[PDB]
Amino acid sequence: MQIFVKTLTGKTITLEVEPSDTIENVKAKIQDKEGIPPDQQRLIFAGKQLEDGRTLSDYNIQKESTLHLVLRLRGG
Amino acid sequence: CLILVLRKAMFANQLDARKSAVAGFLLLLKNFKVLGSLSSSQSHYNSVANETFCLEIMDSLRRCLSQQADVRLMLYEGFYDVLRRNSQLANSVMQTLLSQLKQFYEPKPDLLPPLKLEACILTQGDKISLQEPLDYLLCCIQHCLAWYKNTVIPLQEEEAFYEDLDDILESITNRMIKSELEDFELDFSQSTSIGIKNNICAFLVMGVCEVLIEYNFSISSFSKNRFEDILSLFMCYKKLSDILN
Amino acid sequence: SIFVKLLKISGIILKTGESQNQLAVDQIAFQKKLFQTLRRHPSYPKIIEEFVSGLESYIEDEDSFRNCLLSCERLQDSYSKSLIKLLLGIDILQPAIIKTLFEKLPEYFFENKNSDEINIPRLIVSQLKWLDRVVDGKDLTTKIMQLISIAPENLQHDIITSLPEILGDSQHADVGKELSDLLIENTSLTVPILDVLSSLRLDPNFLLKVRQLVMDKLSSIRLEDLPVIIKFILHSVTAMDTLEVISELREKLDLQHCVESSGQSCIILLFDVIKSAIRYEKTISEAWIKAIENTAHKVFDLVMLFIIYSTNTQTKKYIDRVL
């Protein structure tokens, strides 16, 4: 189950997350791949803030999902 | 987290953001007390953590210093309070200032100027602006050196630079009294960039001349030769002011 | 060997394999003692040159490079950064280090195609951020432009979005003019260039050209691109040009014809950008009300009017009367 993370400026990141995982695992994987720390970044889907500490199964995440990434502070 | 957002805030193009971040840097390093030998008050148990934190903050300040003029002005204004509330970091700060001094103070006493107008001013396309006020550099150096000489040495391997700084200022005194307007190309307004840089240089030489008056009056202890130097230096300043008027 | 000898004398324990390099002393202590040892060693140019030679000889092995460029480990009975960052922190060694890094990078262009473990150029750009001082702006400009020319879309994009941290204060104007030349040349990487132009410090006179070039294409860009372009437009305007650009962008809105979940996410991103811009840029805020009052019907304008009433307390009674 691949998911496209779309950061600002149009950059695409392909990343695999199983359906049973949670948003904390997503942020940890993003730190592992991109190096951004987990607490700093923020994710949004369907124009709705991803509530921390909740599984992605509650959200309507499907195959080839698009999750938009925004960083509070510029350049990480 | 605070230091993270400050260091992330360093490269913001907004001038107010840069000045805010630098003032925050100076204030926070002022408040964190180095437990080892800091001079009284007006203290976390991890003293070595404080020390290394202050030193890496000083490295960030080394990054900070090469920036536009307002940041440098605030930096040199705040180093005196930093030195007053924190004494050990002075051993770095003066050296950092000395590096800036070595960026403009020529070593040869035979050479006439202690200031290079090209490096001092931000020469750039279609405009002219200040980069680093050398008068404020000498101002901060004089106040820090006077504070240390008045407080720490009486309170008491690497001492030599202190007298070297005195020697530097002594050489900056001498060459200046022997100086003249021909070196600085004086005797200029906002009509042309040439006049703009000449006016800025006039302000700079006036400022560093009066800071040299401060230094010479401080160290002389009322000697006839030193006060003769003060009189000649102030006469140079007076004719500069009259020319500007 | 002399490189390794000086390195181990400096107190950092090199550790190959899985174990990362250990710090006997602190980062600053390592920097101070290494700089003092190099300064006081005889034959300063020769010792520096053979140190660089031994460094580039040691770094040939792939495992050596991978363990070197990663973050170190703190060895005590603070936080540990990479030893390459420690080497960058020393001013005298910086041009040798950056030359070694940028001659090494073309080797790993092929590696970028197959390396599933870790992205080598991504990490290298990561270490290269947050430096102390630029030893030579011209060298950085030439190296960055070489990477822009030769590297593929992903790597050139990565260095572009990393540009504000890499560059010092000095190289703003020339790099800005050269990336505008790239904007004229190419169209694919235009949006990241718009982002760094928003971030970087450039004068209004140079910004006028890019503003004129990009205002024509604002009517013909997808929804995914838009919020960073309007971020540039709102943060790259003078005091007198506010009403003109506000009226022009409100007339050239693409939401009427544009309006999946990504679309709604992008719309809230547009509105977050507008909230950030309006909250502090007062002249733009007041010019918005003045421009729409002069106009005297668009839904996007009405939502912007609602949030303007929400955020700015000073415009409360005024915007109530205007509504």
Swiss-Prot record, chain A:
Q: What would changing residue 76 to A do, according to UniProt?
A: Loss of ADP-ribosylation
What does the UniProt record report as the effect of altering residue 65 to D in this chain? Phosphomimetic mutant that binds and activates PRKN
Q: Crosslinked positions for Glycyl lysine isopeptide (Gly-Lys) (interchain with K-? in acceptor proteins)? A: 76
Question: Ubiquitin-like domain spans which residues?
Answer: 1-76
Q: How is it modified after translation?
A: Phosphorylated at Ser-65 by PINK1 during mitophagy. Phosphorylated ubiquitin specifically binds and activates parkin (PRKN), triggering mitophagy. Phosphorylation does not affect E1-mediated E2 charging of ubiquitin but affects discharging of E2 enzymes to form polyubiquitin chains. It also affects deubiquitination by deubiquitinase enzymes such as USP30. Mono-ADP-ribosylated at the C-terminus by PARP9, a component of the PPAR9-DTX3L complex. ADP-ribosylation requires processing by E1 and E2 enzymes and prevents ubiquitin conjugation to substrates such as histones.
Spell out the subcellular localization from the entry.
Cytoplasm; Nucleus
Listed result of changing residue 74 to K: No effect on ADP-ribosylation
Classify the source by domain of life. Eukaryota
Q: Which residues carry this modification: (Microbial infection) ADP-ribosylthreonine?
A: 66
In the record, which positions carry Phosphoserine? 65
> What are the residue positions of the site described as Essential for function?
68
Residues carrying ADP-ribosylglycine: 76
Site positions (Interacts with activating enzyme) are 54, 72
Disulfide pattern: none
- Chain positions of cross-link Glycyl lysine isopeptide (Lys-Gly) (interchain with G-Cter in ubiquitin): 6, 11, 27, 29, 33, 48, 63
Resulting phenotype, residue 65 to G:
Phosphomimetic mutant that can recruit PRKN to mitochondria
Known outcome of mutating residue 72 to G:
No effect on ADP-ribosylation
According to its UniProt entry, the function of this protein is described as: Exists either covalently attached to another protein, or free (unanchored). When covalently bound, it is conjugated to target proteins via an isopeptide bond either as a monomer (monoubiquitin), a polymer linked via different Lys residues of the ubiquitin (polyubiquitin chains) or a linear polymer linked via the initiator Met of the ubiquitin (linear polyubiquitin chains).
Q: What is this protein called?
A: Ubiquitin
Q: Which organism is it from?
A: Homo sapiens (Human)
Segment of the intact protein contained: 1 to 76 of 128
From Swiss-Prot, chain B:
Q: How does it assemble?
A: Homodimer. Part of a FANCI-FANCD2 heterodimeric complex that binds and scans dsDNA for DNA damage. Interacts with FANCL. Interacts with MTMR15/FAN1. Interacts with POLN. Interacts with UBL5; the interaction promotes FANCI homodimerization.
**Could you state what the record's PTM comment says about this protein?**
Monoubiquitinated by FANCL on Lys-8 during S phase and upon genotoxic stress. Deubiquitinated by USP1 as cells enter G2/M, or once DNA repair is completed. Monoubiquitination requires the FANCA-FANCB-FANCC-FANCE-FANCF-FANCG-FANCM complex. Ubiquitination is required for binding to chromatin, DNA repair, and normal cell cycle progression. Monoubiquitination is stimulated by DNA-binding.
Compartments annotated for it: namely: Nucleus; Cytoplasm
> Domain description from the entry?
The C-terminal 30 residues are probably required for function in DNA repair.
Q: Which family does the entry's similarity section mention?
A: Belongs to the Fanconi anemia group I protein family.
The UniProt function text for this chain reads: Plays an essential role in the repair of DNA double-strand breaks by homologous recombination and in the repair of interstrand DNA cross-links (ICLs) by promoting FANCD2 monoubiquitination by FANCL and participating in recruitment to DNA repair sites. The FANCI-FANCD2 complex binds and scans double-stranded DNA (dsDNA) for DNA damage; this complex stalls at DNA junctions between double-stranded DNA and single-stranded DNA. Participates in S phase and G2 phase checkpoint activation upon DNA damage.
PTM Phosphoserine: at which residues? 41, 189
Q: Where is this cross-link: Glycyl lysine isopeptide (Lys-Gly) (interchain with G-Cter in ubiquitin)?
A: 8
* Stated name of the protein: Fanconi anemia group I protein
From Swiss-Prot, chain C:
Q: Where is this region: Interaction with BRCA2?
A: 196-283
Q: Where does tissue-level expression of this protein occur?
A: Highly expressed in germinal center cells of the spleen, tonsil, and reactive lymph nodes, and in the proliferating basal layer of squamous epithelium of tonsil, esophagus, oropharynx, larynx and cervix. Expressed in cytotrophoblastic cells of the placenta and exocrine cells of the pancreas (at protein level). Highly expressed in testis, where expression is restricted to maturing spermatocytes.
Where in the sequence is Phosphoserine found?
A: 170
Q: Where is this region: Interaction with FANCE?
A: 1-239
PTM: Deubiquitinated by USP1 as cells enter G2/M, or once DNA repair is completed. Monoubiquitination requires the joint intervention of the FANC core complex, including FANCA, FANCB, FANCC, FANCE, FANCF, FANCG, and FANCM, and proteins involved in cell cycle checkpoints and DNA repair, including RPA1, ATR, CHEK1 and BRCA1, and is mediated by FANCL/PHF9. Monoubiquitination prevents DNA release from the FANCI-FANCD2 complex. Phosphorylated in response to various genotoxic stresses by ATM and/or ATR. Phosphorylation on Ser-170 is required for S-phase checkpoint activation, but not for ubiquitination, foci formation, or DNA repair. In contrast, phosphorylation by ATR on other sites may be required for ubiquitination and foci formation.
Q: Which residues form a coiled coil?
A: none
Source domain of life is Eukaryota
Disorder:
Fanconi anemia complementation group D2: A disorder affecting all bone marrow elements and resulting in anemia, leukopenia and thrombopenia. It is associated with cardiac, renal and limb malformations, dermal pigmentary changes, and a predisposition to the development of malignancies. At the cellular level it is associated with hypersensitivity to DNA-damaging agents, chromosomal instability (increased chromosome breakage) and defective DNA repair.
What is this protein identified as?
A: Fanconi anemia group D2 protein
